Curated annotation (Swiss-Prot):
Sites where a glycan is attached: 63, 104
Binding site for heparin: 160-163
Residues of the full protein shown: 388 to 623 of 625
Gene source species: Homo sapiens
Active site as annotated: 44, 93, 188
Outcome of mutating residue 16 to M: In FA11D; dominant-negative mutation that results in severely decreased protein secretion
Protein name: Coagulation factor XIa light chain
Intrachain disulfide bonds: 29-45, 127-194, 158-173, 184-212
Residues covered by the Peptidase S1 domain: 1-236
Length: 236
């Protein structure tokens, strides 16, 4: 998170830290709790992941320093990548982690709803991007969970900044015209959560963009509402 501030415990309870344990154990990507044994993340996070054996999902984590050799975690039973996925910049950057056990919901770990059936025309004015990612292009993974309010930009406006990319209706962009606040390396997979009528919705999944928080270069996200049918087909 570029231009963000620290979160407090139980602020983003659907946020998870997916770790890899090969060749070293570290924060790989972010994710969202969308069900008792379901995590919604981005497919590109599993590039070079040979099997779910090396992964660990940590929920209820504020600082990465809280993760010790005795810290509880969830094993991943299955990694469901979108069948159409190839590269992040081209879309379908959506994956589902099916955990080995159910999540007991508390204040530090609860599920986030997907955009509602009938809220397609909603103008989201309170969107937030969260994660433990970099604060600049050549940085390191953060300790506390950063947050950033980012305005959504239209598909047409976003397509102007990305003349060399195909910005589809399965993508949503968020950024400030003069840069400053954005998600960077380590934030992918995580949520772009927008609050509407005091309910949080998982509106996007952190995906890609030219550099981190550059001017007139919005963050590109997976448009969750478009994939709700895929998610329901898989989580049933
Ligand atoms: O993809 C990750 O987060 C971490 C990761 C996992 C697996 C393989 C590669 C990899 O890192 C690639 C990498 C390198 C530098 C910056 C980014 C990055 C990430 C997100 C966003 C932006 C940029 C621009 N702003 C909008 C959001 C990604």
């Amino acid at each position: 998170i570029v231009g963000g501030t620290a979160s407090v415990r139980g602020e983003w309870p659907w946020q998870v830290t997916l770790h890899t344990t090969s060749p070293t154990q570290r924060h790989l990507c972010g994710g969202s709790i969308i069900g008792n044994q379901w995590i919604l993340t981005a497919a590109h996070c599993f590039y070079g992941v040979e099997s779910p054996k090396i992964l660990r999902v940590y929920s209820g984590i504020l600082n990465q320093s809280e993760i010790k050799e005795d810290t509880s975690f969830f094993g991943v039973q299955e990694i469901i990548i979108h069948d159409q996925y190839k590269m992040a910049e081209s879309g379908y950057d959506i994956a589902l982690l099916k955990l080995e056990t159910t999540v007991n919901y508390t204040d530090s770990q609860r599920p986030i709803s997907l955009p509602s059936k009938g809220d397609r025309n909603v103008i989201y004015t309170d969107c937030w991007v969260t994660g433990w990612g970099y604060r600049k292009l050549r940085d390191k993974i953060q300790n506390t969970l950063q947050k950033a309010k980012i305005p959504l930009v239209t598909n047409e406006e976003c397509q102007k900044r990305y003349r060399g990319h195909k910005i589809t209706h399965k993508m949503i962009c968020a950024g400030y015209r003069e840069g400053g606040k954005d998600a960077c390396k380590g934030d992918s997979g995580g949520p772009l959560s927008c609050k509407h009528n005091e309910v949080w919705h998982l509106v996007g999944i952190t995906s890609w963009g030219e550099g981190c928080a550059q001017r007139e270069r919005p963050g590109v996200y997976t448009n969750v509402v478009e994939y709700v049918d895929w998610i329901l087909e898989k989580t049933q």
